[PDB]
Ligand binder design. Sequence first.
Ligand SMILES: O=P(O)(O)OC[C@H]1O[C@H](O)[C@@H](O)[C@@H](O)[C@@H]1O
Ligand SMILES: O=P(O)(O)OC[C@H]1O[C@H](O)[C@@H](O)[C@@H](O)[C@@H]1O
Ligand SMILES: [Zn+2]
Ligand SMILES: [Zn+2]
Lengths: 188, 188
Amino acid sequence: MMYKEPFGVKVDFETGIIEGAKKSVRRLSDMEGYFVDERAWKELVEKEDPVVYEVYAVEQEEKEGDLNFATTVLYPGKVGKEFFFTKGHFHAKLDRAEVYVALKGKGGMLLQTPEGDAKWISMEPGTVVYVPPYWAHRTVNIGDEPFIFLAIYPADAGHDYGTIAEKGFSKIVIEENGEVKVVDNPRW
Amino acid sequence: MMYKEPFGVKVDFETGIIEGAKKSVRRLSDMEGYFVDERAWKELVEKEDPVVYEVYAVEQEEKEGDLNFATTVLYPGKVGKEFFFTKGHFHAKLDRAEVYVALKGKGGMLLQTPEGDAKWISMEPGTVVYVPPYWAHRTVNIGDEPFIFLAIYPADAGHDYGTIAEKGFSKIVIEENGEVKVVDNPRW
Ligand SMILES: O=P(O)(O)OC[C@H]1O[C@H](O)[C@@H](O)[C@@H](O)[C@@H]1O
Ligand SMILES: O=P(O)(O)OC[C@H]1O[C@H](O)[C@@H](O)[C@@H](O)[C@@H]1O
Ligand SMILES: [Zn+2]
Ligand SMILES: [Zn+2]
């Protein structure tokens, strides 16, 4: 049969960049209906519309058994009191797991089941996070530099953004009184 | 509904130790029939029997879509001219891919199709290697310090050592005249 070519790519642990990879950029304007404070959101899009995160993805065709990988560069910032985060998604094939390796910066992961039960996992450089089957997953930057990580996921996992885009996560991550707090989402 | 609990674990990029993982140790004596220089193997076993590699594995049940991960510490050394390496394997489910992230030291990966078509990929810290479906894979330490890396693989991939145990790879990685060479395996 035909076999695909093995390859190596260099990942820059300082920047998160993978040369030759498919780069995506999410600005604040790409994230309407995501943050609790919509007026803060609106003002920030009008003033500056900052980059929230960059993704450098190395993807295969969607086949059982195969693997994708991507780095994400999550910029530091808040919308109101709420730290910058990734959109978050379930997988289209719902039982697909995921593995994240934290490389630089300070943050964590919010995860939740289709029932809506949430989990928070702190991430520092060297933290490996196991995302099990069925858990939606979103990363949050709670520090003052880019939070940079590498994610490895099944090529056929796909992305299911819709549920999260409408209702969000049952927990939010905010700064209150000079302190990082994981608290119930008011809008849940 | 049964949902597995997400977790995070600290991986020390300087040691490759994962606390709480299933630890495997492979000494040179566990690697009979793997090295070209059989007399040099037997002598090093009698004189020292060093640890060739240690694995720290975090494994799930063998389920489609789920993921395992493991770090490996491949110690520096040669049997004759041939650098220390992992046993190497195809996956039991052949079409399963793997992703490796190099963390410390200097090394590389030898890859091979069921037809014996071979490939060599250099690995240095920050190198990410894509191991495609159907390729057997073996890591090699070409330096004087430990070669440390993380691997993420499908939970139902399995391991097939047999073919590699008896026949080996079609290429070998040796030190000849002060330089690293990937050359034809003379025993192939
Ligand atoms: O939830 P989002 O916006 O897809 O961001 C998450 C992104 O980061 C990670 O690198 C991976 O999980 C990607 O699959 C994903 O695209
Ligand atoms: O199994 P081998 O060839 O001895 O290599 C040692 C280990 O290296 C990597 O960490 C992974 O691919 C493991 O699945 C493997 O067991
Ligand atoms: Zn995912
Ligand atoms: Zn493997």
